[PDB]
Design a protein around this ligand. Structure first.
Ligand SMILES: OC[C@H]1O[C@@H](O[C@H]2[C@H](O)[C@@H](O)[C@@H](O)O[C@@H]2CO)[C@H](O)[C@@H](O)[C@H]1O
Ligand SMILES: OC[C@H]1O[C@@H](O[C@H]2[C@H](O)[C@@H](O)[C@@H](O)O[C@@H]2CO)[C@H](O)[C@@H](O)[C@H]1O
Ligand SMILES: OC[C@H]1O[C@@H](O[C@H]2[C@H](O)[C@@H](O)[C@@H](O)O[C@@H]2CO)[C@H](O)[C@@H](O)[C@H]1O
Ligand SMILES: OC[C@H]1O[C@@H](O[C@H]2[C@H](O)[C@@H](O)[C@@H](O)O[C@@H]2CO)[C@H](O)[C@@H](O)[C@H]1O
Ligand code: NA
Lengths: 140, 140, 140, 140
């Protein structure tokens, strides 16, 4: 009865500053990558205020970006991998006035400055090499 | 049917922290400069909480300033030009507690610390060497 | 009909984050010092969340402090004097989540981190070598 | 009639950004340590968004941590002791968007970045080598 992928669901009330999203799943044993998108609308090539994108590669890293008017911006990356193949994780996004704060398994991970206004984000999209267990929205 | 210049319109409800303004237009092919003012009232020499002022010069740059009791303060500038002559742009201002954040074509550009209280800004004024397409206020 | 000194008046609704105070007066020609206190209650030795205290001395400076349970804390100071003897000034305090931001004559001056919760401040007290013209509270 | 220890009480309305907690007690003469927990629920091994934990040791210090899904995260510490054995103290926590700000006896002490969303904290727990006099919640 776990959510199938791709997961795409509205954020109840829309995204607003002060909200958090909290995200339990498992990285697949053979994971290459997955993403979570804070999306502007329901369409499938919707703009994305915040794309959070762990990648196992040469350098295991997380990539962060925004898609606006259909175009990816300047990638930010952190060359650190807080997920592990085959392991359960807890992934939390907190929406602060200046940034999304990302916390993985209780460990602060990254702060991504807003590039598109928070109150454009209406949907959460999740897909890739993971199994999704729960998604809960808080404070909205 | 595009807006004529100078454009001067009230911000619905007044400016408040958490609001954004999003601004589509085109830099003219022969642009020297333009500005967007976050203005205190409707009069034509009203104070300006935030003047955003791209200038092609020797050094292509953006100038940022505040006019208070009729006098320009200390200019801030960034010696980088995110607009291009003859090209369409997307210009976003996000009103955070400490600053206006400016994002141009999806690329974070500048943070201008507040010098006059946000809740004095009642009007948006736009003028100069641009063609204006849309202005949308969000979160207010 | 200008306000007499010491000036002590309630802040309508109490102080809250997002509020500003804006303060027109004149430094006296023979000014040594003055202060503005964000006070906890109406009594005369009330605690003070934020004491803003320009001083002409050897080093012309502004002193910033908090009085809690009747005791002054660690002074902060900036060795710069934005007022001038005999001159009119505009003094603005903006209450942000992390600090009071002080702006004098349109020029950002200082950010004083909160030491006592903002929602303890109920009164504004002003006294010293100045003539007071106007005090206006915004956003509360 | 002072509160007995361990003290565990709900935060009226739940914790929210903008709230403060203010905490008068006395360090015991023979204090080794005490803590204040911002807890997620009433159970006794509840998760803890913020554990504030002064310790007299070799190095007198304060330890700060989060317990999530039953596990302590990466300790932060400050090798400074703002309490003193046998002395009364005033301990204030201010909940800002990015961090808890800790102020002890009027002196700013530490800012602890949020690791679990504020709006998960429902209870305050206090225990250890102290005598507790008052706990007051503000702005909620
Ligand atoms: O930036 C987020 C997107 O990256 C896209 O891939 C990039 C790649 O990371 C970069 O190195 C370069 O090769 O350009 C590619 C296309 O922009 C992914 O295709 C996309 O899914 C996002 O992860
Ligand atoms: O600071 C914003 C205003 O600048 C004014 O021009 C300045 C100029 O930039 C500066 O170098 C100096 O020469 O003083 C001028 C007058 O203050 C513009 O006239 C005004 O429109 C704003 O852009
Ligand atoms: O810190 C704000 C208060 O300062 C007091 O004076 C201080 C003085 O600045 C310091 O150098 C030292 O001498 O201790 C004095 C007493 O704490 C003023 O008396 C008071 O009005 C505030 O300005
Ligand atoms: O981090 C907060 C908790 O610390 C626990 O003790 C730690 C200790 O500080 C550390 O040095 C190491 O030895 O691991 C211990 C167990 O995680 C306390 O037991 C606990 O009460 C908290 O203070
Ligand atoms: Na902030």
């Amino acid at each position: 009865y776990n959510p199938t992928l791709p997961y795409k669901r509205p954020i109840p009330g829309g995204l607003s500053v002060g909200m958090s999203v909290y995200i339990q799943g498992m990285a697949k044993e053979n994971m290459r990558r997955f993403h979570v998108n804070f999306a502007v609308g329901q369409d499938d090539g919707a703009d994305v205020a915040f794309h959070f994108n762990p990648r196992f590669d040469g350098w295991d890293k997380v990539v962060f970006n925004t898609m606006q008017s259909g175009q990816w911006g300047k990638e930010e990356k952190k060359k650190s991998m807080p997920f592990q193949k085959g392991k359960h994780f807890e992934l939390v996004f907190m929406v602060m006035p200046e940034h999304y704060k990302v916390v993985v398994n209780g460990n602060s991970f990254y702060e991504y400055g807003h590039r598109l206004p928070v109150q454009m984000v209406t949907h959460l999209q999740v897909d890739g090499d993971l199994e999704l267990q729960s998604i809960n929205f808080l404070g909205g």
